[PDB]
Amino acid sequence: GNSPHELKNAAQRAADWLVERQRPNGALPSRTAVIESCYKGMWALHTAGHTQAASAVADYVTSLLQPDGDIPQPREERYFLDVHYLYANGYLTIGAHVLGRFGLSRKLMSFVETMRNPATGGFRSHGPAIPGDGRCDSVSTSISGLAALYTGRVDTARSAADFLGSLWVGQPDRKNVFHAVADASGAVLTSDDAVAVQVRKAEGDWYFIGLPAFFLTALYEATEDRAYLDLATDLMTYMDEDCDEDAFVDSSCGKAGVAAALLYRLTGRPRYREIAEGIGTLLCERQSPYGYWSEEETGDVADLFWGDLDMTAEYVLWLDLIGRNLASGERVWA
């Protein structure tokens, strides 16, 4: 296994790669100019110490900001339209707030809450102009709840956890499928077109479970309400015993790993470090030597396809969070 020192060095290598190729307007080196290519940029580069590069992304994001606090364009990927439209918005809010861009995050978080379903506590999956039926998913709700934490809107975070709690206990067939979406009225949306994770198979989408586990663990730390800890503990046990191991192998397993590392610092259970260390080590070995993570690229490239840039900035963040909670976990418990 690799140590938190080595998980961190892998994070700083990718963060160096990004800063080397950042555009003068602040955009990260994406082959296509879309918001889903750099929405984790402010947060990731801040945790890596590249604050001027993170502030540059904040300048690029601010110049794209609409009067209502949203960035509806440039968007291309289908998932950032009607699957989890607020995935970009949630990371933008956290990254702007930790940077001290209080005007940016306040406007981003204001719009995020305009998407909240007051009847259920979830957040709408499709953007204002995107066709949809008002469905709310676990990813939009957990990332908005996490963004609610960093901005101090704890009541919104609490209402988001109620949605995830109701979504968990409403699972009709949890051993075979995880329905990560509810309709606009609070019922678990078991429709064919709704996101549903095939648990016993190896077909990705695990972060629809891992990100709620991350959010719920953070809200527990914020509140020490055991209801949030028990629900996060269930989701982790669910992904460990009931889920196919691809839940900890697929590219979206970093959310589970961050949650396990957080849970280890908060509980001291050794299996949480096991899941956290194995996931963090797994992502380290996949890193290209130039710093970036990618699926098809292997050479000294000057830019990346939008999915690889986002994955690269996402792994700077996940390896850092896992590394700092494993390090603090040993100090506290061991």
Residues of this chain that interact with its own copies (CB under 8 A) are 4-5, 8, 12, 15, 24-26, 46-52, 54-56, 58-59, 97-103, 106, 149-154, 218-219, 221-224, 320-321, 323-325, 327-328, 331-332
The binder of 308, among its own copies, ligand A1EJ0, ligand A1EJ2, none, by C-beta within 5 to 8 A per type, is ligand A1EJ2
Q: How many CB atoms lie within 10 A of CB 141?
A: 35
Q: Give CA–CA dist 95/108, Å, rounded.
A: 11
Q: Which residues pair with 182 in a beta bridge?
A: 136, 188
The binder of 198, among its own copies, ligand A1EJ0, ligand A1EJ2, none, by C-beta within 5 to 8 A per type, is none
Q: How many CB atoms lie within 10 A of CB 142?
A: 34
Closest CA to 215 of 105, 271, 319, 138: 138
Q: Cβ neighbours of residue 50 under 8 Å, at least 6 residues apart?
A: 15, 16, 18, 19
Nearer to ligand A1EJ0 (CB atom), residue 195 or residue 229: 195
The binder of 1, among its own copies, ligand A1EJ2, ligand A1EJ0, none, by C-beta within 5 to 8 A per type, is none
The binder of 295, among ligand A1EJ0, ligand A1EJ2, its own copies, none, by C-beta within 5 to 8 A per type, is ligand A1EJ2
CB-based burial label for 227 (10 Å; 0-12, 13-18, 19+): middle
* Binding-site member from 268, 307, 324, 333 for ligand A1EJ2 (CB under 6 A): 307
Q: Give CA–CA dist 265/277, Å, rounded.
A: 13
Selected range binding ligand A1EJ2 among 45-53, 59-67, 140-148, 303-311, rule: CB under 6 A: 303-311
DSSP state string for 13-75: HHHHHHHHT--TTS--SBSS--GGGTTTHHHHHHHTT-HHHHHHHHHHHHHH--TTS---SS-
User: How far apart are CB 269 and ligand A1EJ0 at their closest, in Å?
Assistant: 26
Selected range binding ligand A1EJ2 among 52-60, 233-241, 276-284, 307-315, rule: CB under 6 A: 307-315
User: How far apart are CB 295 and ligand A1EJ2 at their closest, in Å?
Assistant: 5
* Binding-site member from 70, 250, 277, 310 for ligand A1EJ2 (CB under 6 A): 310
Nearer to its own copies (CB atom), residue 75 or residue 106: 106
User: How far apart are CB 79 and its own copies at their closest, in Å?
Assistant: 25
Cβ contact 214:259 at 8 Å:
yes
The token pair at 274 is: 């096991």
Cβ contact 132:80 at 8 Å:
no
What are the residues binding ligand A1EJ2 (CB under 6 A)? 79, 251, 295, 305, 307-308, 310-311
